Amino acid sequence: HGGGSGFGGQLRSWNPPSESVDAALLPNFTRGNARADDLVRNNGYAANAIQLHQDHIVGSFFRLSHRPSWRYLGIGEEEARAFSREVEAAWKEFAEDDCCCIDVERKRTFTMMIREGVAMHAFNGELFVQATWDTSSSRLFRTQFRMVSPKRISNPNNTGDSRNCRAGVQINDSGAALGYYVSEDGYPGWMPQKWTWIPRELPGGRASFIHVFEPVEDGQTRGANVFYSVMEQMKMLDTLQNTQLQSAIVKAMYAATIESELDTQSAMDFILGANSQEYAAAPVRLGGAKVPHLMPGDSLNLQTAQDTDNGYSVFEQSLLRYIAAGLGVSYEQLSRNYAQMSYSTARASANESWAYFMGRRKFVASRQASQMFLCWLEEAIVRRVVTLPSKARFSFQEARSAWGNCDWIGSGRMAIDGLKEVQEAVMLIEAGLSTYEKECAKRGDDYQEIFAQQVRETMERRAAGLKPPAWAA
Amino acid sequence: YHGGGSGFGGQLRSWNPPSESVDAALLPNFTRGNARADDLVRNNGYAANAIQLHQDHIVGSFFRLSHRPSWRYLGIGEEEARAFSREVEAAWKEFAEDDCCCIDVERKRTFTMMIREGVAMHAFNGELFVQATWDTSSSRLFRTQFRMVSPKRISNPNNTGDSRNCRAGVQINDSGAALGYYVSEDGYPGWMPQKWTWIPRELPGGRASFIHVFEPVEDGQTRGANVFYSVMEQMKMLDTLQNTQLQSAIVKAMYAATIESELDTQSAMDFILGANSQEQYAAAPVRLGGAKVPHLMPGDSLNLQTAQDTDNGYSVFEQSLLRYIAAGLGVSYEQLSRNYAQMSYSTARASANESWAYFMGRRKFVASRQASQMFLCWLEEAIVRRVVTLPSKARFSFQEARSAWGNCDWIGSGRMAIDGLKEVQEAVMLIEAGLSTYEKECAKRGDDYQEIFAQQVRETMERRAAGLKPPAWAA
Amino acid sequence: HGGGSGFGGQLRSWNPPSESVDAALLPNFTRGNARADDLVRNNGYAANAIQLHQDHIVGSFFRLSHRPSWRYLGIGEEEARAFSREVEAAWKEFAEDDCCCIDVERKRTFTMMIREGVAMHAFNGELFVQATWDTSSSRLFRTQFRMVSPKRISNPNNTGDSRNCRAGVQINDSGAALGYYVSEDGYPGWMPQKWTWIPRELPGGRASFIHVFEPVEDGQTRGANVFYSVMEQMKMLDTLQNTQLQSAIVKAMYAATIESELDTQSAMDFILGANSQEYAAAPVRLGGAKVPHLMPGDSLNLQTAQDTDNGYSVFEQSLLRYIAAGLGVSYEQLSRNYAQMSYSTARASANESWAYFMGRRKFVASRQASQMFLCWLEEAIVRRVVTLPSKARFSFQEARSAWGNCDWIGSGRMAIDGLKEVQEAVMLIEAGLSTYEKECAKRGDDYQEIFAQQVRETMERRAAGLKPPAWAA
Amino acid sequence: RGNARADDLVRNNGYAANAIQLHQDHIVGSFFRLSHRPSWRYLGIGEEEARAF
Amino acid sequence: APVRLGGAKVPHLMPGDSLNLQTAQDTDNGYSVFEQSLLRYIAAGLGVSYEQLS
Amino acid sequence: QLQSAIVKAMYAATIESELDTQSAMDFILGANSQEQYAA
């Protein structure tokens, strides 16, 4: 019933023309992305939200744990874990290279690559990273990952969209992507722009161009930035903030008035002190109380003005509540307002935001990181850097997902209190419901080097002969 | 009774709802309702947030699978049962979360986010369609693939009328059970006309080519309805209140003052405000210095209006409307509104408890059903390919015992802690008092017990090898 | 004294007739059901109430526990236990069949059967389940169930109600039902409908039709939806909500008024900025303060509007309190406001609502489920899929209830605190005041398979050799 | 007429219907179990026989 | 004449006409406190506790 | 009481012009642009 006409007419003329999400996105995709860029780069709340996304979804570090499927290939866990630690060491050496040689621009590190990718997916709808093979043999690995902004992927020569060519994305009959038309920069605008078609998949099976996003319904080719639901409200809120600030300026910049048929200069001289005795009308020295002697006919009135904020703070309250609902981050995080909050309420809000951020990490950062991991692993294996066991039933290409199966550990949820958190972890270990690996992962560490470091610490302490720690015999 | 007829002194005399079946009250403008719901979710913070928590709570980040075949019904020794179960679980784990992204034809989704998409689709349109396709290419070990189909693609071919057994592009028998569907090819851009294709619901071999999942309310309903239907108009008018009140605050805070001179504008601003000194209409900008007391003569006056409060009860009215909206959507009010203030511990527990109960119901009846459907579809291809060794002495083959063989359950992200220490204390008391098993506790935390036991054994072995310390599971 | 006229006349003209509730219900039965459908489909509170009914009466699952009357039939305990175990296994296999072919519509499962029936009885007054024997023998059981809406049960050809034929229900002299006049699908309305007479009881003793509703007094044939005492109030609350929303819209929309004798175009040109240099009148750019120079005879009256919720929220509060009293659910559950809340108070309110929910589950969900179970069990017996003991004193037909005596376990009472409840249950079952069966049932589980699972878990742990759990020797 | 007014109130008033609802749900609740305790001492019958009966 | 309740309505009363919404008056202007005192007196007379009676 | 509220917050605003209803509502509220009483 509610979809037809509404109560008493009401929404008699609200008829959205039901369409596929591509039909609603592509015609204004560039304008929406530009508006999102403007909002993120010129609004405090948007910048704070993007910063929160980067620092919570990923955080300071993005550690890797490689878990190849030994049981699928029947390979013994001993050699499997040996190979796993070998590739872990090699990837650790490659990832944190201070030369920033993992990217062609030589301006970022792998963790910063992940953070930039997730931020780009958030405030633009998706991300694109291409893999290149430089000819410099001085490096062990010749694979470089170069990110490209979604603005740089569009229809060549601004050609109109077709069935198989939408937004410069080559799509087959089934809807899968095959190639992308990417343009170089246009700065400065004097030089013309050209386009290059990059196949999504290189013929040998090694991915060359990885495009990451999540859809809302079938046939979608480009994602939608999260700001779409709240961009209008955010811009109007910014306008309200600026206008209210200017109005307070004005109402506070007219303190009093003097009415007199006398000359203005004489009026200032005989009322507001003045210094005409010695362009700008008259400066007035700031001194004592200076009671004047206004004459029958003239008067001096002190403007009482108006309260600078007549509830506009509550309007911010509601508006950033709506916006925080829009981006899914907790309101108190977005607005940095933590008033009238108890322990349970803050814990609940943090819980919801943490759940959302883990969802984003699994479905944005984890996928991109895994893609680059497989791309690097292909080169590492083919370059004889790491040797696969001879027992391997399947070659690397056939079981590429199984061979390079891995997970990623970001910055853990560091607690509101911690002592309760640490007590929970301790008694969880005592009860046996959880293992050490999950505890370290939740705290953001990996248990294997934790055990190695504890062994080092105990042997060092025994050598120095002070006291065995709480792990002995 | 007395309320049925006319009401209290006339009252609702004109309110005579036209009682028909659900289809007759939904099919006429079903497309318009779906369009309105889609527009609401696309361009409204609250609706997008609501579907966001739907996805994030109904299934969470992961959707683990456990396969519990009914060996007693199959009359098969439990040892072969668990062996085959772990084999199929390993195969399915490899196939599902593979980075090849060849589970889906579009090569852009994974299994868990496919379930998320299905849950959201069933949320803001009341339905979900998954087409299972047998790929011809032999390059892949598993030729099965799943493509999500939007309900907008499901409609009566050529936009004709609806017969007794042909409703909204769905073919039904006399009993009302669906036999097939009419899926329209996507029509972007709006130039080339669409064409329709018949997809039989079940393959002749019993395979489920098409899977339609929705929560019907009363029999004969071939098409579900979105949850938003109860509160669409209220959401839209709340949005209009947002925009209108915001513009009103804009304009009321705009005009700070008014000057009431009978002179020309230029001289008026020069003598009352300032400006002028032009280099060489837009009037004249005024430098924002300080103080700036003007002088007046009779006939002139400078009036600066006080405007009005920007939140003259707006926040609390919005609170009530959002309360009603959340009641309609079935999620807790604070979750939708991000309004956790003034709330004690017990009340927070109660509200979260209600919302979580609703979410688990939704997951059991929506996500689990679709996931089990695709799992059975994949298991058919897996077993017919002899990649998994069926037990030798099975009383029934796979075809006739499809549900029995593929009896499975799904574990999403668990109810994540509100207190931290208290729920783990609860679990400890349970498994020491013998009122529960490790399976239930691990599931409540989104884990399975078997691999946890394996990992604990591995950690014990590793610590013993390193000679560090035996953990709290020894001998 | 109270019933005659009242103080000072007062109710001098309130003389409701005295008749059987059938005489007060049947004449407007269809209109009442129509109003109930309207409210449940368009009012958010009604939908929330129905959802609460669904997920609290039954919840997410409906487990079976078949306890036959072994002592009454004089059967051995062990044989009866084994028979119960096998029929339970068979029924559990049949109920959650992923074929969805438990019902003819192939659209829902047994838990969905119960949910749909409970909701239908809630917002329509009753529920009808039509049992059917299928001809195709491809499956073990040939029994399916349509869930016929009460809207489809009516007098054939809309004939007037007789003594023995009311609302399409055939009633004997004693008042017991004998058959029902079901109607086919009426969509679309072009094709005329026809009515089929279904006997309530099949000659052999199989329940062809199941009509479930709790009566209110003698001779009732159709139930009454719970909205009857409340629906007018809910509809008018909806109207108040919409009207207040529109009024707030209007009051906020008109911000200022321009008062001048000028030409109106020049009026906005000289006052509200305007863009006359470029009929939608004239748009106004949004910028700074924009102080104007209204001439003598002009004004820029800023409307102060009015508070948008001048007590509407508390009036709401009262109305939803009345409504929640009407449908028996807790006010906080229905209205989703949980403020000024204490632990004991929340416990009390949830306690009352839970008592109501267990009552409704026993008298609606449990009855329909039991009839379902007996209908399936008759076919199960006659198909020899389960064998009756030879000791059986009575045939299945004579002792149908005794053989099929069973109870059902819905979603457990999941508590506000739980930990206190957990300690309570622990010291119950160590104090001997209860038993594991009732505790696990209250938590929503069954004790037999939980014991089997604990045995399996300890066997697995012993095999892996980590540690014996807290159930050994 | 008094009874008719009572039914009118109980059928078309939220508070009255609610009150009847709690009457039913609290006075009797969900179940009404029986416990038969025959007066064996007055009957002069064996306690074991009384319990068996 | 019946009037449909169909949302906000703005009329155009000509000069000489006026529609005025009568503000009415509080429905419990201290009546609850008078009840407080009165049933306190009643409970005192009856011998039962006030909170039980009222 | 409820019914009172229905009409207490349903008239909202009034116009005190001396033109015809059509012209007054056009110049003070909006409307017009009719495709072809009900005001």
Curated annotation (Swiss-Prot), chain D:
Subcellular location: Virion
Modification(s) after translation: Proteolytically cleaved by the viral protease during capsid maturation.
Descriptive protein name: Portal protein B
Family membership noted in the UniProt record: Belongs to the siphoviridae portal protein family.
Role, per record: Forms the portal vertex of the capsid. This portal plays critical roles in head assembly, genome packaging, neck/tail attachment, and genome ejection. The portal protein multimerizes as a single ring-shaped homododecamer arranged around a central channel. Binds to the terminase subunits to form the packaging machine.
Native source species: Escherichia phage lambda
Name of encoding gene: B
Complex and partners: Homododecamer. Interacts with the terminase complex composed of two small and one large terminase subunits.
Curated annotation (Swiss-Prot), chain E:
Localization, UniProt: Virion
Record PTM: Proteolytically cleaved by the viral protease during capsid maturation.
Function: Forms the portal vertex of the capsid. This portal plays critical roles in head assembly, genome packaging, neck/tail attachment, and genome ejection. The portal protein multimerizes as a single ring-shaped homododecamer arranged around a central channel. Binds to the terminase subunits to form the packaging machine.
Subunit structure of this chain's protein: Homododecamer. Interacts with the terminase complex composed of two small and one large terminase subunits.
Family, similarity comment: Belongs to the siphoviridae portal protein family.
Protein name: Portal protein B
Lineage: Viruses, Duplodnaviria, Heunggongvirae, Uroviricota, Caudoviricetes
Segment of the intact protein contained: 321 to 374 of 533
